[PDB]
Amino acid sequence: PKHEIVPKEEVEEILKRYNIKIQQLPKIYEDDPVIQEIGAKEGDVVRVIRKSPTAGVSIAYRLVIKRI
Numbered sequence: 551p552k553h554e555i556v557p558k559e560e561v562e563e564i565l566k567r568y569n570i571k572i573q574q575l576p577k578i579y580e581d582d583p584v585i586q587e588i589g590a591k592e593g594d595v596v597r598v599i600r601k602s603p604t605a606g607v608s609i610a611y612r613l614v615i616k617r618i
Contacts, residue, residue: 555596555612560588562596565612570600572610580616592616 553566564584565572580591596612 551601552599553597555598556594557588557590558596561585561590561594561614564588565596566598570598571608572596572598572612573608576610576612578612578614579618580614582614585614590614 551570553562555562585591592614594614599609601607
């Protein structure tokens with residue numbers, strides 16, 4: 551699996567620890583108090599791939615963007 555994100559220094563484990571997925575939503579606003587704690591803002595993209603045979607395979611990618 552893999553995970554590819556820019557601000558992975560921290561956004562990698564957050565968007566990937568939840569479940570290396572994002573499916574729920576491969577998009578996030580830079581107004582999040584979470585990304586602010588890391589300093590990610592803006593238009594950053596995050597990739598998260600998981601494979602599991604067991605589960606399946608899944609590939610997702612988040613993308614923090616300001617909003618507006």
